[PDB]
Every structure is written in structure tokens, then in C-alpha cells.
């Protein structure tokens, strides 16, 4: 309800394109297919590329009025980015080649032509209607059944964010909408229908095209969160380590997260190994992604407060923790023998990123075990955790460059490892964390923060963890600067979609993703690139869930130089909201709402005064902090 005007999601599921972008050949009244009136008559070989304004998804229907020849055809091509607009092909989903247009033999007669959900286009902003025959074809409409997020009201958000910075607001809502697009009907999964047949080492020529379909049921239930709407349309655990919290503070569609998580845990091996991806992707060993599955279960319990779910899955979670701990060696660090990660290079040995994620997982597991009163596993865990810290900063810390090396035998400093080490509290001091934040920011290029472990690549995925690291190191304006630089490029570059966020690109500002050779296959709607949504709600607005469903919370707004911030979301316990206005580095007004029955703490920084409750309770701030605050509405006096 609040700030609904920023919500990108369509107001219906019956969608005509918004505007005509380009016309080729004799075409009468192309604007008719935008709902502007009349019918559109294609006279011979012709085409019209239409623009929807935003990235959309679903099932195309061609309403034909007449066709002069029995051999007439109408084709439809789709593309996320405008650089792959073509009257001959879509953009790519497979490892090599462009996808074939959807061809309708409309030479029969009048009626609506469709091939249903088997050929759902998972994501596209531009749609080209093509007549490749000398026939005259009149069409009444070409519309889309919008099938992204199938069991929800697309414009009924439970979270919101609005600041004095309009770019930040648009970035928040673009992340939320991206997540909506990646929630699919589970019966239309697996866009990689050519896995095994089409590989990177191949060439599909200009007249050659890839066939595509969507008919693998990837989860149970009626909705699930995938990595990318166009592609892979599969469940990936690492992507959830950014996507879950951004879903939780905007749409609250944690049911799709839950189906994805359950499908992943259903693939656990007897020894506890969790999968690299959901079915039918290759059974692959990946340390880090197994740990991401553990992270995801922990965060799901944190936001839903589902005791029954955690109880169902605690045995599997402990088995996974045991599997990961089996990699720890005499050193006290995990020695990673699997190279598979987020499509980066050099995963192995005493990798800083793997061990930081392990530290994070261990602390998650201890807090969960205390929630469940399962004290037995705690000891080992604590000890192991300590060792990681103690050894990771002795054998991996580079004091001269202010960052962690990737392992013991390299001078490379990975962005993911250092970001995660700050996010997991692997550093021995806040001063260290500030060094890491400063040194990461020192590496920014004209198009955002680099990930040297994956070559000349910018990763919005790792950008989300770096944002969190800048925040936890006490640098909110550094984080807002990275937001502006990287995500304003992702949102406002004319090749982007202006609604959804890219999977990754290159440091020179090109849309080359190094792991892929088929550049049209990069997805422009990946949930793992939506870090700013959760970051702006949690850190800028200061609404931090610290207990199940917000049973306990921390209010720590890190405003920086923003002069006005409003944000809010809900859990099954009630409403969280934060609202403040500043000027000259001081709060003019500050208020926040937390659900009843909850208790929390406050941390405003260098702020002195009283917090007044709705009833009238007054609490003095000591060092900008206060604890034991009872749930409700609070204002700063």
C-alpha cells in the first residue's frame, strides 16, 4: 500500500506492450497491438518491435483477424536487453546460439494462437512480431499472460523504502521487482534443456537457432524462487544468500523461498552433502554452495520464526554442518578440494571465502542450537569457529595490502572472501574491518566494484556482500556511493532493462560475463543481485531482525548523509517501520514501530536524549544505546 507508485509490477496479468519501438516494412496501425485501437495489418515481409517498458514474463497469444494465404506465418521473438532485438531470433538461454522465434502458422484462419506454458518466456522487455511471408495478415492483439509470481498479488507489497535519494528508491524497487520475476510456476523450470548437448565449446551460426521449452517441475508447490527468470529457471543455494532477505523485506513471498529450500534439502546425500543446484542440474560437489544451503535454512527460520520447519529440518542441518566440518584439518581451516563456486576461479586450499562462510554458518548453528535447547553440538562448534578466526587471520591476513589473500600461496585478494570475512566477523577488530572496507573501495572502477577472483568481472552478487561489509564497518556513505556507482549503472544503462538487475558484467562496462561465451545468455533479472533492497531496509533504515520473526530486534539506522528515510516490512508478528529526518548530521525527527510482545535494543550512534513510547514510557540513551525496549511505537525526544 505505501509508496505503491514505485512498484514496477504490472497491474494486470493480461498485458499488451506499452509502445511501438520500431517498424519495418508496410505495417498498418502497429500501435493497435498496444491497445490504442483498431487492428494491425502486416503487408508482406515486415516486423514490429514493441517495448513493454519493464521486464515481463509469460505466455504469448496471437489474435489473428485475417490471413490472405494458407502459408502465412507470424513469429514472435523476445529479448531482455535491447541490444539483442531481432526479427530472426530471441536472446540466448543456452550455452551457445540464439533461441528460435515462436512461429504460428496463422494461414488457417481467425482465432487465438498459443502454445501455452510449455514455451513460457521467462524474461523479456522487447517483443518483435514478424511476418516472413508475402501474405497480408491483420492482427487484433498480441498479448502476454504474465506468469511470473503466479500465486500472489503482484502490487500488494508488505515492505517499502523511500529516501530523499530517488536513485536509491528506484534501486530498492527494481530489486523487489527482480525477485518477483524470479518466482516462477514450478512446472515451467529448467531453461537449460540442452545441458550435455550444447556446451560453450560450440558455434551456432546466424541462420541456426536453439529450440527451447519450459516443462521440468523443479520443486513442489505452486511457486518457487529461481536464479534467473529467463535462465536457468533452476534453484541455486548461493543466490538465496542474497535473495531471501530482499524477498523478506519487500514481497514477503517466503513460500517460494521455502519450496526452493525444501527441494534442495531433498537432495542431501547420506553423508550430509547438500547439492550445488536443484534438479536436473549435474550432481556436483561444491563446498560453498552446501554452506549456502545451511545459511539459507538459518535465514528462513530467522525471518519466518517457523519452529515446526526448523524442527523438521534440524537433523539435516546438523548433518550438513558435520559434512562441512569434515573438511577442517590440523591447521584449523577447511581445506577445500572442490573448485565449484559462484562461477569464480581458484576455489581450493585454505580459501578465505569458504572459511568465512563456515564461520558464519557455525555461529548460525550455535544460535539455532540454543533456540532448540540442543546443547550437545555447541562445544565443538564454538571451538572450531574460534580456530578458524585465530588461524585465518594468521595465515591469510596481508597486513601490507589491508586485505585477506585468497589462500596461503597467492597474492590475489578476492572481493568475496574479504566481504564475507567482514560480514561474518572474522576480523579481530573493528579497525581491521574498516581497513578492509577502505581497501575494497580503493579498487572501484568506472562501472562498480571488481571481483578479481573471476577476472575482469563485476558481480552484483558479491556487491551485495560488499555493501553489507561497508555498513558493518561503519561506512554508510561508502555503501551508498557503491550503490550509486554500480546499481545506477545497472538500472540506467540503455542496454539494461530499467526494471530488473543483471547477473554480472565486465569492468570495462561491457555486458560480457567471463564464464559465458554466448553473451546474449547473460540474464538481466537475477535475484542474487538484489542486495540493495535488504541493505537499504536493514542498514540505512536500521530495522534488523535479530530473533525469530523479529521476536528480538535491533534498531541501528546508519543514515549517512541522507536527509529523509522511511522503510518498513512485516512478519507474522506484526509491523516493523522506521522513519527519520536529518539535517546537518543530526536527527530532526526519528520514530520506529516494532511488533507487540517483542523486545529489542537501539543503537543510534552519537545521539543523546530520550526515547518516548506511545504509553509514555521514557528511556534515556546511554552512548546512543538502549536495551530491553518493549515492542510498540517509539519516538526520539
Ligand X SMILES: *[C@@H]1O[C@H](CO)[C@@H](O[C@@H]2O[C@H](CO)[C@@H](O[C@@H]3O[C@H](CO)[C@@H](O)[C@H](O[C@H]4O[C@H](CO)[C@@H](O)[C@H](O)[C@@H]4O)[C@@H]3O)[C@H](O)[C@H]2NC(C)=O)[C@H](O)[C@H]1NC(C)=O
Ligand Y SMILES: *[C@@H]1O[C@H](CO)[C@@H](O[C@@H]2O[C@H](CO)[C@@H](O[C@@H]3O[C@H](CO)[C@@H](O)[C@H](O)[C@@H]3O)[C@H](O)[C@H]2NC(C)=O)[C@H](O)[C@H]1NC(C)=O
Ligand Z SMILES: *[C@@H]1O[C@H](CO)[C@@H](O[C@@H]2O[C@H](CO)[C@@H](O)[C@H](O)[C@H]2NC(C)=O)[C@H](O)[C@H]1NC(C)=O
Ligand U SMILES: *[C@@H]1O[C@H](CO)[C@@H](O[C@@H]2O[C@H](CO)[C@@H](O[C@@H]3O[C@H](CO[C@H]4O[C@H](CO)[C@@H](O)[C@H](O)[C@@H]4O)[C@@H](O)[C@H](O)[C@@H]3O)[C@H](O)[C@H]2NC(C)=O)[C@H](O)[C@H]1NC(C)=O
Ligand V SMILES: *[C@@H]1O[C@H](CO)[C@@H](O)[C@H](O)[C@H]1NC(C)=O
Ligand W SMILES: *[C@@H]1O[C@H](CO)[C@@H](O[C@@H]2O[C@H](CO)[C@@H](O[C@@H]3O[C@H](CO[C@H]4O[C@H](CO)[C@@H](O)[C@H](O)[C@@H]4O)[C@@H](O)[C@H](O[C@H]4O[C@H](CO)[C@@H](O)[C@H](O)[C@@H]4O)[C@@H]3O)[C@H](O)[C@H]2NC(C)=O)[C@H](O)[C@H]1NC(C)=O
Measured CA to CA, the distance from residue 216 to residue 187 in angstroms comes to: 6
Tell me whether residue 210 or residue 239 sits nearer to ligand W (CB atom). 210
Site string for ligand X, 403-442 (x = CB under 6 A): ---xx-xx-x------------------------------
Q: Is 400 in the site for ligand Z (CB under 6 A)?
A: yes
Q: Of 345, 379, 341, 376, give the one whose Cα is nearest residue 362.
A: 379
| CA 220 to chain CA centroid, nearest Å | 21
Q: Is 59 in the site for ligand U (CB under 6 A)?
A: yes
Scanning residues 121 to 140, which ones bind ligand Y (CB under 6 A)?
128, 132-133
Q: Of 147, 169, 56, 6, give the one whose Cα is nearest residue 524.
A: 56
Measured CA to CA, the distance from residue 62 to residue 60 in angstroms comes to: 7
Measured CA to CA, the distance from residue 203 to residue 517 in angstroms comes to: 10
Q: Is 181 in the site for ligand U (CB under 6 A)?
A: no
Measured CA to CA, the distance from residue 389 to residue 494 in angstroms comes to: 44
Tell me whether residue 329 or residue 408 sits nearer to ligand Y (CB atom). 329
Measured CA to CA, the distance from residue 404 to residue 413 in angstroms comes to: 6
Q: If you compute the radius of gyration of the chain from its CA atoms, what whole number of angstroms results? A: 25
Instruction: State phi, psi for 262 to the nearest 5 degrees.
Output: -65, -40
- Contact (CB, 8 A) for 142 and 62: yes
Among 105, 112, 151, 156, binds ligand U (CB under 6 A): 151
Q: Is 337 in the site for ligand Z (CB under 6 A)?
A: yes
First vs last C-alpha separation in the chain: 29
* 394 contact, one of ligand X, ligand Z, ligand W, none, CB 5-8 Å limit per kind: none
**Which position's Cβ is nearest ligand V?**
596
Among 428, 442, 588, 589, binds ligand Y (CB under 6 A): 428
From residue 617, give the alpha-carbon distance in Å to each of 146, 276, 502. 50, 51, 48
Scanning residues 543 to 582, which ones bind ligand Y (CB under 6 A)?
561
Tell whether the torsion through CA atoms of 548, 552, 555 and 558 is positive or negative.
negative
Tell me whether residue 454 or residue 536 sits nearer to ligand Y (CB atom). 536
Q: Is 506 in the site for ligand X (CB under 6 A)?
A: no
Tell me whether residue 432 or residue 558 sits nearer to ligand Z (CB atom). 432
From residue 480, give the alpha-carbon distance in Å to each of 171, 234, 463. 11, 31, 12
Q: Is 456 in the site for ligand X (CB under 6 A)?
A: no
- Contact (CB, 8 A) for 36 and 43: no
Residues in binding contact with ligand Z, number by CB under 6 A:
9
Give the DSSP letter of residue 303.
H
CB of 612 to ligand V, least distance (A): 14
CB of 593 to ligand V, least distance (A): 6
CB of 117 to ligand W, least distance (A): 10
CB of 572 to ligand Z, least distance (A): 43
The grid cell for 304 is: 519466518
* 337 contact, one of ligand Y, ligand Z, ligand W, none, CB 5-8 Å limit per kind: ligand Z
Residues comprising the chain, all counted: 637
Scanning residues 345 to 374, which ones bind ligand X (CB under 6 A)?
345-346, 348-349
Give residues in contact with ligand V (CB under 6 A).
Answer: 596, 614, 632-633
Number of C-beta neighbours around residue 506 at 10 A: 18
Scanning residues 272 to 331, which ones bind ligand U (CB under 6 A)?
none
| CA 39 to chain CA centroid, nearest Å | 39
Q: Is 587 in the site for ligand X (CB under 6 A)?
A: no
Site string for ligand W, 203-242 (x = CB under 6 A): ----------x-x---------------------------
* 325 contact, one of ligand U, ligand Y, ligand V, none, CB 5-8 Å limit per kind: ligand Y
**Applying CB under 6 A, which part among 144-152, 166-174, 189-197, 529-537 lies near ligand U?**
144-152
Q: Is 23 in the site for ligand X (CB under 6 A)?
A: no
**What is the CA angle 369-372-377, rounded to 5?**
30
Q: Of 163, 155, 107, give the one whose Cα is nearest residue 132.
A: 107
| Binding positions for ligand W, rule: CB under 6 A | 213, 215
Residues that bind ligand X (CB under 6 A): 339, 345-346, 348-349, 406-407, 409-410, 412, 453
Instruction: List contacts with ligand U (CB under 6 A).
Output: 13, 59, 145-147, 150-152, 222
Amino acid at each position: 500500500v505505501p509508496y505503491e507508485e514505485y512498484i514496477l509490477a504490472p497491474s494486470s496479468r493480461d498485458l499488451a506492450p506499452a509502445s511501438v519501438r520500431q517498424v519495418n516494412g508496410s505495417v498498418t496501425n502497429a500501435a493497435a497491438l498496444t491497445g490504442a485501437g483498431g487492428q494491425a495489418t502486416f503487408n508482406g515481409v515486415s516486423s514490429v518491435t514493441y517495448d513493454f517498458g519493464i521486464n515481463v514474463a509469460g505466455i504469448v497469444s496471437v489474435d489473428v483477424a485475417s490471413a490472405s494465404s494458407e502459408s502465412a506465418f507470424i513469429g514472435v521473438t523476445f529479448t531482455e536487453s535491447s541490444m539483442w532485438i531481432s526479427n530472426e531470433a530471441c536472446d540466448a538461454t543456452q550455452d551457445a546460439g540464439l533461441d528460435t522465434p515462436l512461429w504460428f502458422a496463422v494461414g488457417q484462419g481467425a482465432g487465438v494462437y498459443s502454445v501455452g506454458k510449455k514455451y513460457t518466456r521467462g524474461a523479456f522487455r522487447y517483443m518483435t512480431v514478424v511476418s516472413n511471408t508475402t501474405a497480408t495478415v491483420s492482427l487484433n492483439s498480441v498479448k502476454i499472460n504474465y506468469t511470473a509470481s503466479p500465486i500472489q498479488d503482484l502490487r500488494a507489497y508488505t515492505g517499502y523504502f523511500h529516501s530523499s535519494d530517488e536513485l536509491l528508491n528506484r534501486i530498492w524497487y527494481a530489486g523487489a521487482y527482480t525477485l518477483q520475476l524470479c518466482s516462477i510456476d514450478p512446472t515451467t523450470g529448467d531453461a537449460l534443456v540442452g545441458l550435455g548437448a550444447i556446451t560453450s565449446s560450440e558455434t551456432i551460426t546466424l541462420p541456426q537457432t536453439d529450440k527451447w521449452w519450459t516443462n521440468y517441475t523443479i520443486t513442489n508447490g505452486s511457486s518457487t524462487l529461481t536464479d534467473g527468470a529467463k535462465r536457468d529457471r533452476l534453484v541455486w543455494p548461493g543466490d538465496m544468500s542474497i535473495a531471501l532477505e530482499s524477498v523478506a523485506v519487500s514481497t514477503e513471498d517466503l513460500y517460494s523461498v521455502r519450496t526452493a529450500l525444501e527441494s534442495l534439502y531433498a537432495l542431501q546425500k547420506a553423508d550430509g552433502q547438500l547439492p550445488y543446484a536443484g534438479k536436473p542440474f549435474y550432481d556436483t560437489v561444491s563446498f560453498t554452495y552446501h554452506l549456502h544451503s545451511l545459511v539459507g535454512a538459518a535465514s528462513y527460520y530467522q525471518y519466518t520464526g517457523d519452529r515446526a520447519w526448523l524442527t523438521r529440518y534440524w537433523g539435516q542441518y546438523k548433518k550438513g554442518v558435520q559434512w562441512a566440518l569434515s573438511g577442517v584439518d590440523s591447521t584449523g581451516l577447511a581445506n577445500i578440494t572442490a573448485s565449484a563456486d559462484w562461477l569464480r576461479f581458484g576455489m581450493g586450499a585454505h580459501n578465505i571465502e569458504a572459511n568465512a562462510i563456515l564461520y558464519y554458518v557455525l555461529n548460525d548453528a550455535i544460535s539455532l542450537a540454543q533456540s532448540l535447547n540442543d546443547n550437545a553440538p555447541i562445544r565443538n562448534w564454538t571451538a572450531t569457529a574460534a580456530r578458524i578466526k585465530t588461524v585465518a587471520n594468521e595465515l591469510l591476513w596481508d597486513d601490507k595490502n589491508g586485505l585477506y589473500t585468497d589462500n596461503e600461496t597467492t597474492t590475489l585478494h578476492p572481493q568475496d572472501g574479504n566481504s564475507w570475512a567482514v560480514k561474518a566477523n572474522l576480523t579481530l577488530s573493528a579497525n581491521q574491518s574498516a581497513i578492509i572496507s577502505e581497501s575494497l573501495a580503493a579498487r572501484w572502477g568506472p562501472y562498480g566494484a571488481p571481483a578479481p577472483e573471476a577476472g575482469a568481472t563485476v558481480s552484483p552478487f558479491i556487491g551485495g556482500f560488499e555493501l553489507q561489509a561497508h555498513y558493518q564497518a561503519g561506512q554508510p556513505d561508502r555503501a551508498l556511493d557503491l550503490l550509486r556507482l554500480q546499481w545506477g549503472f545497472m538500472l540506467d544503462d540503455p542496454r539494461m532493462t530499467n526494471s530488473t538487475f543483471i547477473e554480472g558484467y565486465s569492468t570495462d562496462g561491457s555486458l560480457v560475463y567471463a564464464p559465458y561465451t554466448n553473451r546474449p545468455r547473460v540474464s538481466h533479472a537475477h535475484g542474487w543481485s538484489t542486495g540493495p533492497t535488504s541493505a537499504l531496509t536493514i542498514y540505512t533504515a536500521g530495522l534488523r531482525v535479530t530473533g525469530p520473526a523479529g521476536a528480538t530486534w535491533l534498531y541501528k539506522p546508519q543514515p549517512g548523509n541522507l536527509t529523509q528515510v522511511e522503510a518498513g516490512f512485516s512478519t507474522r508478528l506484526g509491523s516493523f517501520a522506521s522513519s527519520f529526518s536529518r539535517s546537518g548530521g543530526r536527527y530532526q525527527e526519528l520514530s520506529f514501530t516494532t511488533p507487540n510482545g517483542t523486545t529489542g535494543s537501539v543503537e543510534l550512534g552519537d545521539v543523546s536524549g530520550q526515547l518516548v513510547s506511545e504509553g509514555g514510557v521514557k528511556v534515556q540513551l546511554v552512548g546512543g544505546k538502549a536495551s530491553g525496549l518493549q515492542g510498540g511505537k517509539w519516538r526520539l525526544n
